[PDB]
Design a protein around this motif. Structure first.
Motif, PDB file in Angstrom:
ATOM      1  N   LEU A 130      31.362  44.284 -76.417  1.00 21.42           N
ATOM      2  CA  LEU A 130      29.909  44.146 -76.470  1.00 21.42           C
ATOM      3  C   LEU A 130      29.210  44.178 -75.119  1.00 21.42           C
ATOM      4  O   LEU A 130      28.107  44.715 -74.995  1.00 21.42           O
ATOM      5  CB  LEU A 130      29.570  42.830 -77.148  1.00 21.42           C
ATOM      6  CG  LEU A 130      28.098  42.593 -77.415  1.00 21.42           C
ATOM      7  CD1 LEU A 130      27.634  43.539 -78.478  1.00 21.42           C
ATOM      8  CD2 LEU A 130      27.868  41.165 -77.801  1.00 21.42           C
TER       9      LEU A 130
ATOM     10  N   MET B  42      33.547  42.600 -80.062  1.00 25.58           N
ATOM     11  CA  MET B  42      32.289  42.670 -80.779  1.00 25.58           C
ATOM     12  C   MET B  42      32.375  42.039 -82.157  1.00 25.58           C
ATOM     13  O   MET B  42      31.559  41.187 -82.503  1.00 25.58           O
ATOM     14  CB  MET B  42      31.845  44.124 -80.890  1.00 25.58           C
ATOM     15  CG  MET B  42      30.588  44.324 -81.692  1.00 25.58           C
ATOM     16  SD  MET B  42      30.116  46.060 -81.674  1.00 25.58           S
ATOM     17  CE  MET B  42      31.478  46.790 -82.573  1.00 25.58           C
TER      18      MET B  42
ATOM     19  N   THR C 299      26.872  41.287 -84.485  1.00 29.09           N
ATOM     20  CA  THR C 299      27.412  40.014 -84.048  1.00 29.09           C
ATOM     21  C   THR C 299      26.600  38.840 -84.529  1.00 29.09           C
ATOM     22  O   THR C 299      27.037  37.700 -84.374  1.00 29.09           O
ATOM     23  CB  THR C 299      27.446  39.955 -82.538  1.00 29.09           C
ATOM     24  OG1 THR C 299      26.098  39.877 -82.066  1.00 29.09           O
ATOM     25  CG2 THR C 299      28.081  41.217 -82.000  1.00 29.09           C
TER      26      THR C 299
ATOM     27  N   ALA D 138      24.780  38.196 -73.408  1.00 33.85           N
ATOM     28  CA  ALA D 138      26.182  38.452 -73.701  1.00 33.85           C
ATOM     29  C   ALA D 138      27.086  37.467 -72.985  1.00 33.85           C
ATOM     30  O   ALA D 138      28.143  37.096 -73.513  1.00 33.85           O
ATOM     31  CB  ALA D 138      26.550  39.873 -73.321  1.00 33.85           C
TER      32      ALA D 138
ATOM     33  N   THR E 141      33.932  48.656 -79.065  1.00 36.09           N
ATOM     34  CA  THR E 141      34.026  47.213 -78.968  1.00 36.09           C
ATOM     35  C   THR E 141      33.660  46.824 -77.545  1.00 36.09           C
ATOM     36  O   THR E 141      33.152  47.650 -76.781  1.00 36.09           O
ATOM     37  CB  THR E 141      35.427  46.748 -79.331  1.00 36.09           C
ATOM     38  OG1 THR E 141      36.359  47.341 -78.422  1.00 36.09           O
ATOM     39  CG2 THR E 141      35.767  47.168 -80.741  1.00 36.09           C
TER      40      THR E 141
ATOM     41  N   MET F 125      23.946  46.391 -82.321  1.00 40.27           N
ATOM     42  CA  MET F 125      24.205  45.223 -81.486  1.00 40.27           C
ATOM     43  C   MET F 125      23.555  43.983 -82.062  1.00 40.27           C
ATOM     44  O   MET F 125      24.152  42.902 -82.060  1.00 40.27           O
ATOM     45  CB  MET F 125      23.680  45.457 -80.075  1.00 40.27           C
ATOM     46  CG  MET F 125      23.834  44.277 -79.159  1.00 40.27           C
ATOM     47  SD  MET F 125      22.962  44.657 -77.655  1.00 40.27           S
ATOM     48  CE  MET F 125      21.307  44.690 -78.322  1.00 40.27           C
TER      49      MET F 125
END
Ligand SMILES: CCCCCCCCCCCCCCCCCC(=O)OC[C@H](COP(=O)([O-])OCC[N+](C)(C)C)OC(=O)CCCCCCCCCCCCCCCCC
Ligand SMILES: CCCCCCCCCCCCCCCCCC(=O)OC[C@H](COP(=O)(O)OCCN)OC(=O)CCCCCCCCCCCCCCCCC
Ligand SMILES: CCCCCCCCCCCCCCCCCC(=O)OC[C@H](COP(=O)(O)OCCN)OC(=O)CCCCCCCCCCCCCCCCC
Lengths: 459, 119, 87, 220, 157, 128, 73, 110, 176, 59, 65, 68, 171
Positions: A282, A342, A414, A330, A280, A410
């Motif tokens: 991110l 995440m 999300t 991010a 987790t 990734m």
């Protein structure tokens, strides 16, 4: 070169004697002017480097990194508002001047001639990073982040000084030319092994190599966006630049004494790409991604092929742009929801239907989509290491596979499948983040067209 | 077919090996039967850029085949009698190869088994 | 692929397939009826009816509901939920 | 093959979006004369599969298998091409039977329509392609190899032999499907139907292993 | 914000107050709170769950989080990033697991052995090699312009 | 008629053939009642703080926060170096590294000795 | 929005596999099916949808005429 | 007739003893495959005009499909092998996007 | 695992088995007539001992039924193309936009669609007008010291809306 | 008219301008696998025949 | 304005789709007939496969053993 | 009395940004390409001769392209 | 343009197709209409641009350098000889790599123009390629990254001393 040094200084009292709603335009405008000013530099030709004084010079390793620095400042300076515009005017001015002093020492560092001067400017590069990440570290362990940070970087970079002073008073002065033209080979007494170990280990710490990468993840998950972009792009490729220079000396024992570090780098490259598949936070995936690319850099530096150095410098610049962009995205998502985790913020193909275009574009560069620069880097490094041995391509290809899968994870974790529909506060995309994405991914594709600039000294 | 089944089950001596078919010295029951004319003009055969494993027998039928194909291009269905005759020539080549096969086979069989079952 | 369903139409189609079913009558076949009180048939053939609706219209209904329909009006209401029946 | 299966997919998606995107062969049984442009389209495509001799699909498949038969082969690959040709015959005929000429089971309120200029243009263009283009291309190739053409007997017959026995075998399986017994899974059924065991085993074992090692060994 | 005592130091002992505290903390049934136990692998005091749980949880309940089968308050099994559907699907299989692996290994082993039987035993249609025109078609292989003639002929047969 | 479905670490045990579901004691009724009560109260708190028309931000689950803080920051406390931890640490951390180290020594010493003989195929091997 | 409802007591099942399977289940002694549902699947423009070799032999209706004409060509 | 020809231009990073320009070669395969693929794709353009009548995201769909065609063409034409590798990973990633067209549907992005 | 009570019951458990076996018998059996035959056969097999006054022999027969069912299921049970597991599984979720959006639009487009936004605004005033008193009083009013159920009562009091209805009413329309 | 006009002229004009001048000033550039000559032809360029092939028989 | 849907009855067919369906089936069948008969004999091999070589000992070259 | 109402995220801010981006690249994408087109249609590239006898050049008078 | 001496071409060979058809010849119709409808306006435009550029004349000179001596005529540490020595050597290094590039472009042109008979009349160009690349392999190959000049001369001395010992032992 003082033509670049002195307006970077005079951008600092600018920021003091402007006022509210007046600092910003001056700083950003003039920093872009300095970006054009160092776009003027690239003249470098043929026989040798080009000498900007009796004191400064530029290798063609130093030109693209230097231009990358002066590109990356105004991007950063726009990027680091909306998380501090509601703080005080004096503290905001102090922040901007901190970054300008930072850029000043980075230019000092990249255009070095003497390696002792390089060392002074190395740790002068260090000290603003500390102050930024500790003063706006924005989470409860910014304490521990700064503490780990400075003690790894100094206590690795401390005996490097001793080794360079010893070389200073055994082989005359320390021009890069008079380091060249006079270097004589040094055999396998154990003092030579420790001297090589000192220099290479200090820059190993700064890359990171695999056994010293837990320097990194605290120092990026608990940083503000400006110090994170600074730290990732400029500081890691600064460490690589240092080893790329000072590997000119001590070639006759690097073969005998380079075996453990390559193997550490390879098995750690596989392990790091594996460890960024399941975390987790991110923000930290980009950090472990950065360790994966720097492990490939270190493989490329310790093998000593001109093929390898071309691949190394391309991988440096492309990964710098990829990681700096992806940190900025991010931060956009963390400005949306106050999570950093995440699996929380999901959906977002529906909402903000063009933020996803930038996520897709950066994710495919981190995949190394093929016209981009990052594939040029990784491909030539794989070619050079396959000429090194007929066996290492298992590791490189398995790195390619696991890199594909975490980067795609990734992307589609999300920003794919279902919004959690108790969010109801995310704003449609500002012009500012769209501008930041635009400033990252125009030069990456424009170098994807014409990349003969960014290859190294061994072009 | 079952000739290969005989070659795998039975005595493998009298059944020959392929890819090492030339075993016995030549003209053992021929003497003086050879022409191998090959009037296909090998320099010209290389002049038209022919293919490896086509620089072979019955080549001049292929030369006229490509010649009439090029020269009669919009007549899309034209060159068929030359195609059929080149097929017939390669049929005779294949027949001649099979004759070469059973030549060497029956030589090995009848000679070796005759000598070693009457000696 | 969207012919519009409507409330009179879904009422007619559901009552058409109930009327086609064997062991009921076309006389005492009401919209406000019961599968428990007045038609008197059992739970087993009640779920056979639920199977008929699922197999006509093309979608499952879950067993949290098949306990508790027990009348044709709530059948029509529940496909009105699954389909969101207005044009 | 390109002409061939592009035409086949386009016919299939025509059927599926004709019938409310339901796509499954159970609940699709009898759709011959639900307008038979698509039924003609798919029977053209799926009998061009295995090459009804001789159409475009004949040339490729059958000259490949007879040229393989006239080759210093690996003696098991020949029997693999044999069994594969038989199998492709039998599922071709089974999918035609279950799709088209059964008895129509699919949910009511039919909304079938193909009076549609773009679809008849596309399917028209691709059957007109896949009926002639194999002959037209295979005719005027520059001869880049030496054709064999000299086969023994019972080795040129074998292509049509295997495809015909495939048709007959799928036909008799169909006329056993007309019966009623409710037979049982015989585990070769299961090996064919459940993908046999490879996607399930690999997609449930290779993710779990690397992520066991990511958690225990690597990260924590 | 977040309470200091909603973090989680130390395992299970002692069983009255600590298991009461973890039952109040992780929102579980009291005698279903299971620590791992303490082999010192880290792992703190976070629960054990029944560990497959994601091709479970049949999808007509209509909970809150639609693609995760969450309900906002379950204590959330430790290895959840390996269990989002799209990552690992642990369905109850239609057959077994042992029967699967034994039949798959058996089929692929038998077919590779038949490939070896093919590899030692070729087919060929019974025909000698071709009669290349100029000395096994020399001068048009790898080079050799005037080095050596390589005399080998063919006879009409 | 069936070998009673041996389970695995992959094949989940389905809802039907448990066979613990058919030994309903009063304790299982008690546990299912309390478990439904827990799910009831949590959906009540969540739904009231989910449907507030003034609630601008996110609902801020302590479950996700608690899992994350357990997963990363609550590893290093707590720990003791056990035989199992130290053993598996030196195995899965040093084993593959030292193995790959010896095999690259072996490949490199082969290639160095072999081109020291000079009989390698580097007739044109420029792109080194 | 109109449909006009092609109605019940019209199917009247009689469709030969359903009627004969109600015969076989009658000799079985159950005599309680679902009923007159599927006659819209067993008559209409349905009801001996043609057998499988008929679709393959469908070709020469316009076919042999054209073939004999081209033979005459 | 034949007349079987290659094109080769705009060399970039002609670095060491090698070089690489964008270059592609008209022999037989890249010569006369391209009509078949264009013809098939032309009919599928018709069929997806009809089949995707009911989405406003149709324009992005045609952009992805044409992009996939471009990359398949630059794959099948090249002889400079780096350009083949370009076409390789591009057709891979366009396969990724157009399989994952319907977002949602956790089985699809799986 | 269900919202109403703590368990299914015996009755509905047998019932779900009957639904599953009949559905699997669809998925096994094409041609629909032999399907109809075997369906009546299966119904007769449940008719053999429907009327046991015993209970323990009934639930043991339930377990042995589950054994002969799970031995005889299908590899692809016929799932409908609307169900989870099935071919759709929120297929057109591309456009299932929640309606907390559409108010964060620029007022040019709020001028493009005027009447809709006027009536939407009186919807939000309808929501907030009866949010506090009736809804939260009805929630903290009726239940036990623990709630212990997942249903909720209607607003039978006098007038306005049942409580906690906004994300039930305002959902996507499942085919946009 | 305007579609086919602009697209199969203006990029064709630009590429045909591109494919005389710059593409022939780069020297080793577009090159043609050689047009095959057949033994009964003559040269288009200057003009001289090729000797015909010899005797056929026993076809 | 266009074609309608109906319920539980056989769908109506307009004239154009049915006449081109029969046309395309018939033209395939005409093609495969005319091409099966015009020249090939793609089923055959056009050239007779012989016996084993000729079975003619004292021909093909042997000595009488 | 047929049509429905879709629910979009927004069009305003997105299309405003992209409209600004094409306008602000295009405002000096156009005159520069016009300028260089005028350059290689009027001013000449260069010619390929050699060193004149006793005449050293500048450090320009060395390159093909005139802007370089 | 270029030097056809250093970029040789094989002599041209072209036949004339002679139908022997009666369709006839669609592509001839198309290529005549192509020439008249494409090749004419670009010819006129190139005339226009040629006048507009030849109205005034530029020149770019091929740069040429001198020959400063060697590394072997340079002293101990004494940079001011070594500097000219190494830049002279490194410019020879770049021009030597580009010679290798030119040999390889000749080899590619021979592959394409000689066609599917590979081993016919490229073998002299293949011969000179293996010759020149034996030289390059012997001379510049295994020095690695920081080649300056001194490792080059070390390779030189060590190579010819090894060969001297080898011929001394062979005699
Ligand atoms: C790690 C320590 C790096 C210290 C600096 C590098 C160095 O010269 O280490 C050699 C040093 C000392 O070696 P040294 O530098 O004294 O080497 C001998 C030098 N002469 C012959 C001139 C006396 O090693 C250590 O101190 C070991 C640690
Ligand atoms: C190859 C190069 C490797 C270089 C390694 C250098 C040392 C590693 C980094 C040292 C600092 C580590 C650190 O930051 O540890 C945190 C710890 C404080 O943590 P804690 O005990 O929680 O204190 C909370 C206070 N309220 O900090 C401490 O306890 C600090 C203890 C002193 C460390 C000083 C620096 C190292 C000196 C080594 C001399 C021998
Ligand atoms: C070489 C090293 C490979 C390392 C692989 C690491 C990948 C980790 C993630 C795996 C993953 O994505 O798993 C999910 C997916 C599930 O697939 P499945 O459930 O069948 O989906 C169909 C409908 N649900 O499962 C997969 O996608 C499984 C991944 C493909 C198979 C990989 C191993 C095959 C090759 C082995 C080495 C040769």
């Amino acid at each position: 070169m003082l033509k670049y040094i002195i307006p970077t200084m005079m951008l600092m009292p600018l920021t003091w004697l402007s006022k509210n709603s007046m600092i910003w335009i001056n700083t950003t405008l003039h920093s872009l002017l300095i970006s054009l000013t160092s776009l003027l530099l690239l003249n470098q030709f043929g026989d040798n480097s080009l000498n900007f004084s009796l004191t400064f010079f530029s290798d063609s390793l130093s030109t693209p990194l230097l231009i990358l620095t002066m590109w990356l400042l105004p991007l950063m300076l726009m990027a680091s508002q909306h998380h501090l515009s509601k703080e005080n005017l004096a503290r905001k001015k102090l922040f901007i001047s901190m970054l300008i002093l930072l850029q000043l020492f980075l230019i000092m560092t990249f255009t070095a001639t003497e390696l002792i001067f390089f060392y002074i400017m190395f740790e002068a590069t260090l000290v603003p990073t500390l102050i930024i990440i500790t003063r706006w570290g924005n989470q409860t362990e910014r304490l521990n982040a700064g503490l780990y940070f400075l003690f790894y970087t100094l206590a690795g970079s401390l005996p490097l000084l001793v080794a360079l002073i010893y070389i200073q008073n055994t082989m005359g002065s320390l021009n890069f030319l008079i380091l060249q033209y006079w270097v004589q080979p040094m055999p396998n007494s154990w003092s030579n092994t420790f001297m090589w170990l000192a220099c290479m280990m200090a820059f190993m710490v700064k890359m990171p190599l695999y056994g010293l990468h837990l320097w990194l993840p605290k120092a990026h998950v608990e940083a503000p966006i400006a110090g994170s972009m600074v730290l990732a792009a400029i500081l890691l490729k600064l460490g690589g630049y240092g080893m790329m220079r000072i590997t000119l000396l001590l070639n006759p024992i690097t073969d005998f004494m380079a075996y453990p570090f390559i193997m550490l780098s390879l098995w750690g490259m596989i392990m790091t790409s594996s460890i960024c598949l399941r975390q987790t936070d991110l923000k930290s995936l980009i950090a472990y991604s950065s360790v994966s690319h720097m492990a490939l850099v270190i493989v490329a530096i310790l093998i000593q092929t001109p093929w390898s150095y071309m691949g190394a410098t391309a991988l440096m610049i492309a990964h710098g742009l990829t990681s700096s962009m992806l940190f900025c995205l991010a931060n956009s998502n963390y400005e949306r929801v106050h999570s950093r985790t995440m699996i929380l913020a999901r959906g977002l193909q529906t909402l903000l239907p063009l933020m996803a275009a930038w996520w897709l574009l950066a994710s495919l560069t981190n995949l190394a989509l093929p016209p981009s620069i990052n594939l040029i880097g990784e491909l030539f490094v794989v070619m050079s290491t396959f000429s090194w041995s007929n066996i290492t391509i298992i590791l490189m290809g398995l790195n390619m596979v696991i890199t594909a899968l975490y980067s795609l994870y990734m992307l589609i974790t999300t920003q794919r499948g279902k919004h959690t529909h108790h969010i109801n506060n995310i704003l449609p995309s500002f012009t500012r983040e769209n501008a930041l994405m635009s400033l990252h991914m125009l030069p990456l594709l424009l170098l994807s067209l014409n990349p003969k600039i960014i290859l190294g000294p061994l072009y | 077919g079952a000739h290969l089944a005989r070659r795998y089950l039975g005595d493998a001596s009298v059944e020959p090996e392929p890819l090492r078919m030339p075993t016995f010295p030549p003209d053992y029951g021929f003497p003086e039967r050879k022409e191998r004319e090959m009037v296909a003009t090998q320099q010209e055969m290389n002049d038209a850029q022919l293919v490896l494993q086509q620089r072979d027998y019955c080549a001049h039928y292929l030369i006229r085949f490509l010649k009439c194909k090029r020269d009669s291009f919009p007549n899309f269905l034209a060159c068929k009698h030359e195609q059929h005759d080149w097929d017939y020539c390669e049929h005779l080549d294949y027949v001649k190869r099979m004759k070469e096969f059973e030549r060497e086979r029956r030589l090995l069989q009848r000679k070796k088994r005759r000598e070693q079952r009457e000696a | 692929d969207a012919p519009p369903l409507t409330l009179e139409g879904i009422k007619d189609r559901v009552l058409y397939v109930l009327k086609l079913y064997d062991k009921i009558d076309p006389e005492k076949l009401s919209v406000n009826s019961h599968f428990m009180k007045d038609l008197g048939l059992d739970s087993l053939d009640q779920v056979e009816i639920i199977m008929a609706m699922e197999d006509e219209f093309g979608f499952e209904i879950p067993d949290i509901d098949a306990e508790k329909l027990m009348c044709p009006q709530e059948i029509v209401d529940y496909i009105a939920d699954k389909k969101d029946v207005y044009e | 093959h390109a002409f061939f299966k592009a035409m086949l997919f386009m016919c299939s998606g025509s059927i599926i979006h004709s019938l409310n995107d339901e796509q499954d062969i159970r609940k699709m049984g009898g759709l011959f004369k639900a307008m038979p442009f698509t039924t003609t389209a798919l029977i053209i495509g799926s009998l061009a599969l295995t090459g009804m001799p001789f159409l475009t699909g004949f040339y490729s498949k059958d000259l490949i298998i007879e040229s393989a038969n006239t080759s210093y082969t690996n003696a098991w690959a020949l029997l693999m091409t044999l069994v594969a040709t038989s199998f492709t015959a039998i599922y071709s005929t089974r999918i035609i039977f279950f799709a088209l000429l059964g008895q129509p089971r699919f949910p009511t309120l039919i909304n079938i329509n193909e009076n549609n200029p773009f679809l008849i243009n596309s399917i028209k263009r691709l059957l007109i392609g896949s009926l002639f283009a194999g002959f037209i291309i295979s005719n005027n190739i520059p001869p880049m190899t030496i054709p064999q053409m000299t086969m023994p007997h019972y080795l040129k017959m074998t292509a049509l032999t295997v495809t015909i026995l495939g048709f007959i075998l799928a036909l008799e399986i169909s006329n056993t499907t007309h019966y009623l017994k409710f037979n049982y899974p015989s585990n070769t059924f299961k090996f064919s139907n459940l993908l046999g065991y490879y996607p399930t085993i690999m997609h449930r074992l290779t993710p779990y292993m690397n992520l066991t090692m990511s958690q225990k060994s690597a990260s924590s | 914000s977040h309470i200091t005592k909603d973090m989680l130091p130390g395992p299970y002992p002692k069983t009255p107050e600590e298991r009461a505290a973890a039952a109040k903390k992780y929102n579980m049934r009291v005698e279903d709170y299971e620590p791992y136990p303490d082999d010192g692998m880290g792992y703190g005091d976070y629960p054990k769950l029944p560990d497959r749980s994601q091709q479970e949880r049949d999808p007509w309940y209509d909970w809150d989080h639609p693609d995760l089968r969450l309900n906002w308050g379950e204590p959330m099994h430790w290895d959840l990033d390996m269990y989002i559907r799209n990552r690992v699907d642990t369905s109850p299989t239609p057959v077994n697991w042992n029967l699967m692996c034994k039949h798959l290994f058996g089929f692929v082993a038998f077919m590779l052995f038949m490939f070896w039987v093919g590899e030692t035993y070729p087919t060929y249609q019974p025909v000698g090699p071709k009669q290349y025109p100029y000395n096994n078609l020399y001068l048009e292989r790898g080079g050799d312009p005037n080095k050596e003639p390589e005399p080998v002929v063919h006879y009409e047969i | 008629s069936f070998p009673k479905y041996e389970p695995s670490r992959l094949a989940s045990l389905p809802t039907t053939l448990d066979p613990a579901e058919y030994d309903i004691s009063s304790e299982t009724r008690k546990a299912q009642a309390e478990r439904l009560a827990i799910r009831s109260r949590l959906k009540r708190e969540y739904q009231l703080q989910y449907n507030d028309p003034s609630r601008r931000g996110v609902v801020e689950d302590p479950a996700l926060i608690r899992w994350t803080c357990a997963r990363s920051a609550n590893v290093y406390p707590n720990f003791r170096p056990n035989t199992k931890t130290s053993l598996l640490g030196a195995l899965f951390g040093i084993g593959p590294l030292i193995f790959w180290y010896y095999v690259f020594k072996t490949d490199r010493d082969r290639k160095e000795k072999l081109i020291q003989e000079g009989k390698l195929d580097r007739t044109f091997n420029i792109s080194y | 929005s109109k449909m006009e409802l092609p109605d019940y007591k019209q199917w009247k099942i009689e469709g030969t596999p359903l009627e004969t399977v109600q015969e076989k289940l009658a000799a079985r002694g159950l005599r309680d099916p679902w009923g007159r549902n599927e006659a819209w699947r067993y008559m209409g423009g349905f009801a001996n949808n043609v057998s499988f070799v008929g679709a393959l032999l469908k070709g020469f209706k316009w076919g042999f005429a054209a073939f004999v004409v081209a033979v005459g060509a | 007739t034949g007349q079987e020809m290659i094109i080769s231009n705009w060399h970039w990073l002609t670095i060491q003893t090698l070089k690489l320009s964008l270059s592609f070669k008209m022999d037989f395969f890249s010569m006369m495959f391209v009509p078949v693929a264009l013809f098939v794709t032309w009919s599928i353009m018709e069929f997806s005009m009809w089949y995707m009548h009911s989405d406003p995201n149709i324009n992005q769909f045609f952009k992805y499909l044409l992009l996939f065609l471009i990359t398949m063409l630059i794959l099948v034409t090249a002889n400079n092998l780096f350009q083949l590798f370009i076409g390789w990973e591009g057709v891979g990633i366009m396969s990724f996007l157009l399989i994952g067209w319907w977002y949602g549907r956790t089985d699809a992005n799986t | 695992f269900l919202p109403s009570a703590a368990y299914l019951t015996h009755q509905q458990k047998v019932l779900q088995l009957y639904k599953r076996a009949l559905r699997h018998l669809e998925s096994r059996c094409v041609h629909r007539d032999k399907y109809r035959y075997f369906a009546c056969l299966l119904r007769a097999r449940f008719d053999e001992h429907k009327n046991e006054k015993d209970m323990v022999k009934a639930t043991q027969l339930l377990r042995e039924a589950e054994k002969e069912f799970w031995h005889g299921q299908h590899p692809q049970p016929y799932i409908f193309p609307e169900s989870p597991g099935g071919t759709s599984y929120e297929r057109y979720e591309c456009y299932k936009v929640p309606e907390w959006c559409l108010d964060d639009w620029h007022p040019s487009e709020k001028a493009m669609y005027p009447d809709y936004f006027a009536k939407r605004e009186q919807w939000k005033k309808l929501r907030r007008e009866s949010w506090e008193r009736e809804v939260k009083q009805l929630q903290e009013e009726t239940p036990v010291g623990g709630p212990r159920t997942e249903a909720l009562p209607p607003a039978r009091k006098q007038g306005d809306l049942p409580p906690l209805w906004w994300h039930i009413v305002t959902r996507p329309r499942e085919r946009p | 008219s305007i579609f086919a006009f602009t697209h199969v002229l203006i990029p064709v004009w630009i590429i045909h301008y591109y494919l005389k001048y710059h593409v022939t000033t780069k020297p080793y550039t577009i090159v043609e696998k050689k047009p095959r000559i057949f033994p009964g032809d003559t040269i288009l360029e200057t003009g001289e025949v090729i000797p015909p092939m010899k005797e056929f028989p026993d076809q | 304005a266009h074609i309608e849907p109906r319920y539980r009855q056989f769908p109506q067919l307009t004239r154009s789709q049915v006449i081109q369906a029969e046309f395309f089936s018939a033209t395939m069948w005409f093609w495969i007939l005319w091409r099966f008969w015009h020249d090939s004999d793609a089923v055959l091999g056009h050239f007779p496969y012989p016996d084993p070589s000729q079975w003619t000992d004292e021909e093909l070259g042997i000595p009488p053993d | 009395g047929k049509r429905l109402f879709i629910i979009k995220p927004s069009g305003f801010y997105d299309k405003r940004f992209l409209k600004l981006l094409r306008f602000y690249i295009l405002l000096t994408g156009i005159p520069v390409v016009i300028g260089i087109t005028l350059i290689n249609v009027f001013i000449g590239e260069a010619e390929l001769a050699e060193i004149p006898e006793g005449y050293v050049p500048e450090h320009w008078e060395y390159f093909k392209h005139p802007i370089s | 343009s270029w030097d056809k001496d250093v970029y040789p071409e094989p002599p041209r060979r072209t036949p004339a197709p002679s139908p022997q058809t009666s369709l006839p010849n669609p592509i001839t119709y198309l290529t005549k209409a192509f020439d008249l409808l494409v090749d004419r306006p670009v010819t006129l435009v190139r005339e226009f641009i040629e006048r507009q550029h030849a109205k005034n004349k530029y020149y770019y000179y091929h740069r040429e350098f001198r020959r400063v001596p060697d590394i072997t005529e340079c002293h101990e540490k004494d940079v001011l000889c070594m500097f000219e020595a190494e830049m002279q050597w490194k410019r020879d290094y770049k021009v030597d790599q580009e010679i290798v590039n030119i040999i390889q472009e000749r080899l590619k042109a021979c592959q394409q123009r000689e066609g599917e008979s590979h081993r016919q009349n490229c073998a002299k160009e293949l011969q000179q390629f293996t010759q020149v690349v034996k030289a390059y392999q012997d001379r510049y190959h295994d020095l690695g990254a920081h080649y300056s000049a001194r490792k080059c001369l070390a390779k030189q001395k060590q190579r010819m001393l090894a060969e001297r010992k080898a011929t001394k032992e062979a005699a």
